[PDB]
Design a protein around this ligand. Structure first.
Ligand SMILES: *[C@@H]1O[C@H](CO)[C@@H](O[C@@H]2O[C@H](CO)[C@@H](O[C@@H]3O[C@H](CO)[C@@H](O)[C@H](O)[C@@H]3O)[C@H](O)[C@H]2NC(C)=O)[C@H](O)[C@H]1NC(C)=O
Ligand code: NAG
Ligand code: NAG
Ligand code: NAG
Ligand code: NAG
Ligand code: NAG
Ligand code: ZN
Lengths: 596, 195
């Protein structure tokens, strides 16, 4: 016969065995997370080892077929996924030391403890106490101490480790066909073989650069406003022309500015919309919270949840004797099993998070028909994008009033819209410069453009130029500032967040045009529009079978990511920022620094 | 009444074998009463092609054949005239002019175990499509490649049989479904089967 039929039979066998093995592994992991005990840990470890061994064996087997002979625009992608060489091509010693470096980095990040100055009573881990201090404490000296101490604690330790890590991962990439490890990470966005819809690995660089060039005015105006507010809060520390000091941003790394809503609130008198008291008065529970979330997807035209989902999923905190992790997660265990692991309480944030997770499950249900290898989102961004569009639509006052939590009497003014848009701005627009900067720095380091002797110098120079953030205490090459961040330490790609941020607003613009909304984009509800639901389901069903470019074309009418939907979303805040920044300088000067 | 057909034998058999080796049971020389068939568990799919559901008792046939097997939820649709699929072409084929009723009901309670019901098997590799009403039970290593397999597994050498795994937590559509296909044939002989 032809190798194409041989590859087809191989793929059929692999799919049918892999479904069962992945189900066993997923059930073991779910059991461990719901009920933590030694036996559960042993079962999960066994299942994970078995699944990893099976994937390695099948990846080794699949290399027989050259991809040149495969034409089917589906067998080719499945065989490409299997031939990615999850089997470590590196030498045995190189693989062992790479695993050792990864384990050491994870251990240092997790167990990094900061002790009080000249006080040995407490040595604080990053997550429990230090993060809360950075988030809520208003002490400039305390925040500067926390930031500097964490940097010296983790970055100095991890700097040689990060150098060895980048060397080894660059060697792995060179062993593979990819130019560098940045190219390996960007390969997910690559599309080959489909003319007129193709993508290049380097094309992502140009697209991200152009998108940030478009975003920059809004970030500059928000930066000017936040600078004015933080100068009002802290008089002497912040300069008008200078960049913002790092530790005052709101979190340890400056990723999110959500903690600045209290300090930078536009109108104190106007109370934010929150439905906690109303839900308590109406006597809700987590089960009906999730049911109300389900009714939204039923209204949009998507299917509703399975009886197995309702029976197996734990939506309420067991409490008492039971021990479990409370990080929300939507599990597609496989073969028709879908569950949510969420300790849901009666709060507005929990309600929106439930909406987000059920969006995940609707995506998973939609791509269930496709083969196992293609049973994923088209790119790393679409999956959380589909979650986030539902999360945004759920919180709209129109949806709240339709559900009935909000009284018919209430009407929204200019002030409420401005407050909500500025809060979501600090949440969403602020993280884009940080993601852009981190990915640019890491890509340049991987390519080798940034020399080792100038790693941190170039890092802080680019942060000062792009993010408009200046280091409080100057740091030499001994520090490794990026190593502090969780994704940098544990080797996670970070451009996914930028792509998600653009994609969610492109999706929202498309679905709001589908729903025939008139007015500002923020007060847009897609609940009862069955056109928007079908337009979404078109992409949701594809999975990875079609290229992500074609999926994005299907949803939003464009083959490439555009920030125009985001700017249309934040246009009211953009006008308000123009008005408020008439007496405030726009732009930042690099020269100023807190030191000297 | 003189006789009642062994409907409580074709159903309630506690083991329906597998779709690749389907049980071929001959029902004859008895009165066929569908009242008990209705009185059994509610049926996910009860579709009659050749014999009308109302005229099931009225019509008489020489011989009745019931085929019992366990298949997944989505595989139920493939057991129908003119439908093509993995199960339909490689395990069991209803003829083009089939007369009878397809009876299916859920069996998650009995056919699913937490460990897994690996006993049931189906075939997903074969040289050619099966003719209607055919049984194949011989396991020859599939030679998709250009080189003889020599009766062992390896590269381009896969065992045709593959195992369903049935667990209680599986969703509808992958849960084990028990299907008994009633086949009615007219032959040049006294019917001896009247309802
Ligand atoms: C690449 O190969 C795959 C097969 O591995 C092709 O898949 C297509 O899969 C669908 C499954 O729904 C097939 O449709 C079926 O057709 C029969 C006959 O009408 C019908 O009875 C079933 O209900 C179902 O609709 C479809 O025929 C099959 N396509 C081909 C060409 O075999 C996929 O299309 C291939 N991609 C290409 C063209 O490169
Ligand atoms: C993976 O490594 C093997 C050698 O171990 C090689 O034959 C194969 O072509 C590699 N696959 C790719 C696509 O890098
Ligand atoms: C929900 O799913 C069930 C099947 O599980 C279906 O009967 C029902 O119509 C669906 N929608 C509603 C509104 O209950
Ligand atoms: C957790 O699993 C164990 C078995 O390992 C079981 O005995 C126990 O009842 C389960 N639940 C809790 C709360 O421990
Ligand atoms: C959606 O339809 C239901 C039908 O009862 C209606 O009660 C609800 O107000 C509608 N929602 C919107 C936002 O139009
Ligand atoms: C919106 O702004 C205009 C212009 O200042 C003002 O007259 C109007 O009352 C505002 N609406 C409110 C109070 O939300
Ligand atoms: Zn999510």
């Amino acid at each position: 016969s032809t190798i194409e039929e041989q590859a087809k039979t191989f793929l059929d066998k692999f799919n049918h065995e892999a479904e069962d093995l992945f189900y066993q592994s997923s059930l073991a992991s779910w059991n461990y997370n719901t009920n933590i005990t030694e036996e559960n840990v042993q079962n999960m470890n066994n299942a994970g080892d078995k699944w990893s061994a099976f994937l390695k064996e099948q990846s080794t087997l699949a290399q027989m077929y050259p991809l040149q002979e495969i034409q089917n625009l589906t067998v080719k992608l499945q065989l490409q996924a299997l031939q990615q060489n999850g089997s470590s091509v590196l030498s045995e010693d190189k693989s062992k030391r790479l695993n050792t470096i990864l384990n050491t980095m994870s251990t240092i990040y997790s167990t990094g403890k900061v002790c009080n100055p000249d006080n040995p009573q407490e040595c604080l881990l990053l997550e429990p106490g230090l993060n809360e201090i950075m988030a809520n404490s208003l002490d400039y000296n305390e925040r500067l101490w926390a930031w500097e101490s964490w940097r010296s604690e983790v970055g100095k330790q991890l700097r040689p480790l990060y150098e060895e890590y980048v060397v080894l991962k660059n060697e792995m990439a060179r062993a593979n066909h990819y130019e560098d490890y940045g190219d390996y990470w960007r390969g997910d966005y690559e599309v080959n073989g489909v003319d007129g819809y193709d993508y290049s690995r380097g094309q992502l660089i140009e697209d991200v650069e152009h998108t940030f060039e478009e975003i920059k005015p809004l970030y500059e105006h928000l930066h000017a406003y936040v600078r004015a507010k933080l100068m009002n809060a802290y008089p002497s520390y912040i300069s008008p022309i200078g960049c913002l000091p790092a530790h005052l941003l709101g979190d340890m790394w400056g990723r999110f500015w959500t903690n600045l809503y209290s300090l930078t609130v536009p109108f104190g008198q106007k109370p934010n919309i929150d439905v906690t008291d109303a839900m308590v008065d109406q006597a809700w529970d987590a089960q009906r919270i999730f049911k109300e979330a389900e009714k939204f997807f039923v209204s949009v035209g998507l299917p509703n949840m399975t009886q197995g989902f309702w029976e197996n999923s734990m939506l309420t905190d067991p409490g008492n004797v039971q021990k479990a992790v409370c990080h929300p997660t939507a599990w597609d265990l496989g073969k028709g099993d879908f569950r949510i692991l969420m300790c849901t309480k009666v709060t507005m944030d929990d309600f929106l998070t439930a909406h987000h997770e059920m969006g995940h499950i609707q995506y998973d249900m939609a791509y269930a028909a496709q083969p196992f290898l293609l049973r994923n989102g088209a790119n790393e961004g679409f999956h959380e994008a589909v979650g986030e569009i539902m999360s945004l639509s759920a919180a709209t006052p129109k949806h709240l009033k339709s559900i009935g939590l909000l009284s018919p009497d209430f009407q929204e003014d200019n002030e409420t819209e401005i407050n909500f848009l500025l809060k979501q701005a600090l949440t969403i627009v602020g993280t884009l410069p940080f993601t852009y900067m981190l990915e640019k720095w890491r890509w340049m380091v991987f390519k080798g453009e940034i020399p080792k002797d100038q790693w941190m110098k170039k890092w802080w120079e680019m942060k000062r130029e792009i993010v408009g953030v200046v280091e409080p205490v100057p740091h030499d090459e001994t520090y490794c500032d990026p190593a502090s961040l969780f994704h940098v330490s544990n080797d996670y790609s970070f451009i996914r967040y930028y792509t998600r941020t653009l994609y969610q607003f492109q999706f929202q613009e498309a679905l709001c045009q589908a729903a025939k909304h008139e007015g500002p984009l923020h007060k847009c509800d897609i609940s009862n529009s069955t056109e928007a639901g079908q337009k979404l389901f078109n992409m949701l069903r594809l999975g990875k079978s079609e290229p992500w470019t074609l999926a994005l074309e299907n949803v939003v009418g464009a083959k490439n990511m555009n920030v125009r939907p985001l700017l249309n979303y934040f246009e009211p805040l953009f006008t308000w920022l123009k008005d408020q920044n008439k007496n405030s300088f726009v732009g930042w000067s690099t020269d100023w620094s807190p030191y000297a | 009444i003189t006789n009642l057909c062994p409907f409580h034998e074709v159903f309630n058999a506690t083991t329906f074998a597998s779709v690749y080796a389907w049980n071929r049971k001959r029902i004859s020389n008895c009165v066929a009463d569908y009242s008990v068939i209705y009185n059994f568990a509610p049926f996910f799919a009860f579709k009659c092609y050749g014999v009308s559901p109302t005229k099931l008792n009225d019509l008489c046939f020489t011989n009745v054949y019931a085929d019992s097997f366990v298949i997944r939820g989505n595989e139920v649709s493939q057991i129908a005239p003119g439908q093509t699929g993995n199960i339909a072409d490689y395990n069991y084929k209803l003829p083009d002019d089939f007369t009878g009723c397809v009876i299916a009901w859920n069996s998650n309670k009995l056919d699913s175990k937490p460990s897994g019901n690996y006993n049931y098997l189906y075939r997903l590799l074969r040289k050619s499509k099966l003719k209607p009403f055919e049984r194949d039970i011989s396991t020859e290593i599939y030679q998709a490649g250009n080189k003889p397999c020599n009766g062992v597994a390896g590269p381009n050498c896969y065992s045709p049989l593959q195992s369903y795994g049935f667990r209680p937590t599986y969703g509808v559509g992958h849960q084990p479904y028990r299907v008994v296909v009633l086949s009615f044939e007219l032959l040049h002989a006294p019917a001896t089967v009247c309802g």
